[PDB]
Amino acid sequence: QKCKPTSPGRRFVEKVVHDHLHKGAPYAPLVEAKKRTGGRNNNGHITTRHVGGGHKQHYRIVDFKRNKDGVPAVVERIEYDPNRTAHIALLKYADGERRYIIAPKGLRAGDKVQSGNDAPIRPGNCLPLRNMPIGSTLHNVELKIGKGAQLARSAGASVQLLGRDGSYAIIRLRSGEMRKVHVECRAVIGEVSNQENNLRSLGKAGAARWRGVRPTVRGMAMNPIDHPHGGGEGRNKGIQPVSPWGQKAKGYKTRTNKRTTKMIIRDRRVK
RNA sequence: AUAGCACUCUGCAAACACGAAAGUGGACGUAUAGGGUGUGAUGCCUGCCCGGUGCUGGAAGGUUAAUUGAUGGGGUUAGCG
Questions:
Q1: A158 burial class (0-12, 13-18, 19+ CB within 10 angstroms)?
Q2: I want to staple A131 with a disulfide (CB 3.0 to 4.6 A). Which of A118, A127, A155, A195 is the partner?
Q3: How many angstroms is C1' of B18 away from CA of A41?
Q4: Where do Basic and acidic residues bias regions lie?
């Protein structure tokens, strides 16, 4: 869906339209306040540039652990979440408890989900990797027993279960990495919803300002005191590209962790 | 500056930033995400060069630090003259 060019700022706007989303307010008992930061830490200094402004948002409490084992639940509705790119699903359990989960692709109001060792193989069901079938497509992959889902949670994301060896399952991630995960950790059947999210076109600078991104100033445009790229009469680069703090930006690798190297079977390649 | 484009880094106790540390931002986010760099709607497009500098990946040959202390050369004196 592309907007008509009735004004110059509308010529290149492309939105994604899902008519099945809930139109009303979110579920109040599962919503809490959240303040803006401006990219500043407790010293008051800017630690992440280009952050500030944007629309006011509430936080939605999403159940990532899925520890309500054995109790079936029905989907009430699919909701828009301002905190993430994925849609969320409101669940009503057989005992009347309500929770939010990351909505898998295809899930609608009326579908049935559950979690545990003996949960049936359906999208949105949460099971241990030791019980997942080989070759299946999963999302919301847990890394520490009991911590909850951490991997493959963004819109349209999924991982592939390749095999099980010892106490570890082998998974392929969207980045191309092949990784080991302890078989006691849980995952969710299916892929994340809103997979058309990357087809949107903002169309104007105000659309990014609404999302809270402040403008980026190139190092080429500064003075020598501000940036290694600054200075010169006219336009000239004359230097291998670096960050404002002097770290090379073209191909130089920055990973330093040595504690978790054993879990990486095969790197995505040019890391 | 900008929407759009591209390269590259980052598997989460993420990279990156602040700080002496504790800790904090990134983010109560998880590669359709986050940082850095360049270009600047859109249309048609974007040729040749890896010798130099850099980056990435190999090789185990040559060179090299602390550490180690085999040998050789002196000082001194019991004794012998």
A1: buried
A2: A127
A3: 7
A4: 226-236
Measured in angstroms, the resolution is 2.2
**After which residues is the backbone of chain A broken at C–N > 2.5 Å?**
none
Please give the protein residue whose CA is closest to the C1' of the nucleotide B7.
A250
A210 touches strand B (CB under 7 A): no
A118 C-beta neighbours (distance < 10 Å), count:
10
* CA distances from residue A2 to A8, A15, A39, A156 in whole angstroms, order as listed: 13, 7, 33, 22
Using the CB atom, is residue A223 less than 7 Å from strand B?
Answer: no
Report chain A's C-alpha Rg in angstroms.
22
d(CA A91, CA A109): 9
Q: Which DSSP state fits A209? A: H
Residue A218 region, left (φ>0) first, then alpha (ψ -120 to 50), else beta? beta
Experimental method: cryo-EM
CB-based contact A109:A196 (threshold 8 Å)? no
Give yes or no for CB of A260 within 7 Å of strand B. yes
- From the list A172, A139, A4, A150, the residue with the least C-alpha distance to A64 is A150
Strand, coil or helix: what is A205?
Answer: helix
- Distance (Å, whole) CA A116 – CA A256: 36
Evaluate the CA torsion angle A96, A26, A67, A111 in order and state its sign: positive
